[PDB]
Design a protein around this ligand. Structure first.
Ligand code: HEM
Ligand code: HEM
Lengths: 183, 174
């Protein structure tokens, strides 16, 4: 079953509302006035260059960032071309990337929400139609819609009364989610 | 002015014939005799989307290149998917190492290219055309720029000059 961590900052938010906010912030720092854009320009595969246990990317319009964790592979020009595939265990969303292979992995300076124990696995044979590819490809431009669809399905699998319209508070009460430090 | 280094293997080759051979080999390992594919490696240094180098190896063979300068890739920023900035050098050879990046077998390098494309030109920039072409082993854009630079030293020089002739003209070095 999916497990979720959320910053205390977002306790009262629905998952959908949170994802819309992260996506808006990825598109424009001014969706969160008061923020600065000064994160290191870092990211990629860990260890890379085209495979790793993490793939991480930061916006260049803001410090919004994600980290995909699992056992991931990118085909580049090999068939099926431009496919990210493998096992996707977690998606963590927040602000500012730090780290990399040389310091124990990528991290977020502020982790806002992390969706873990996802159990997603896309074989190479599915190419760009794989769920892993669609989720991560969306996030590279700040589009959380594919991620949102998967989170909704995974929550409903726990209990059909849970959904992306549940608040993090409600998911905690249901035993799926727990709070982490302020963002 | 442009400066060229070349393996003596290509002393009597013309620049155009060498580029055609590297491109052919980028496309098919069988394009050269007795070669084996055994080198995916490359990217920006430092990256992820900007660097003093961008390097890539073929998937069909170990043919590879390294672009050197002050390079930027826009990803989704307008104009989207544009590689721009200053391109000072292109090195061509076989098999990538490192990540600065280097070639196991460096065959030819073209340096002091003096190319500079602003972001506003988007994918029409010369830098973009040169490097993007080489990502699929297409050396035509590179070749046209080399030809212009050679003629700027002297109109009698060209991509149909041999490397030895360019050495005699003070532009190339074995
Ligand atoms: C890791 C470093 C990466 C590099 C160097 C890279 C490189 C490229 C290049 C050069 C192209 C253009 C190909 C062309 O038309 O000439 C491309 C296209 C594409 N890339 Fe990647 N990419 C990377 C990562 C990713 C990741 C992680 C994803 C997905 C999660 C992705 C998804 C795609 C897609 C979907 C296309 C368009 C395919 C099409 O519609 O033809 N890329 N990439
Ligand atoms: C540095 C890592 C790179 C990544 C992560 C990357 C990623 C991508 C992605 C995801 C797309 C598809 C866009 C979409 O479907 O909305 C794309 C397309 C493209 N990429 Fe990149 N790319 C990289 C490097 C490069 C480089 C270095 C060049 C040029 C030298 C390049 C040239 C292109 C071009 C021209 C397209 C559009 C292809 C088309 O629509 O025909 N890419 N890239």
């Amino acid at each position: 079953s999916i497990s979720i961590s959320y910053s205390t900052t977002y306790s009262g938010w629905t998952v959908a509302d949170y994802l819309a906010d992260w996506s808006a912030y990825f598109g424009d720092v001014n969706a969160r006035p008061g923020q600065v854009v000064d994160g290191s320009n870092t990211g990629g595969f860990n260890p890379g260059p085209f495979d790793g246990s993490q793939y991480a990317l930061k916006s260049t319009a803001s410090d919004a960032a994600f980290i995909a964790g699992g056992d991931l592979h990118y085909t580049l020009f090999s068939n099926p071309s431009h496919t990210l595939w493998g096992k996707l265990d977690s998606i963590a969303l927040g602000d500012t990337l730090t780290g990399g292979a040389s310091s124990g992995g990528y991290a977020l300076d502020s982790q806002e929400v992390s969706f873990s124990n996802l159990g997603l696995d896309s074989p190479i044979a599915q190419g760009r139609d794989g769920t892993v590819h669609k989720v991560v490809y969306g996030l590279m431009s700040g589009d959380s819609s594919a991620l949102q669809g998967q989170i909704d399905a995974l929550l409903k699998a726990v209990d059909p009364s849970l959904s992306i319209n549940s608040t993090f508070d409600q998911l905690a009460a249901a035993g799926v989610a727990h709070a982490t430090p302020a963002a």
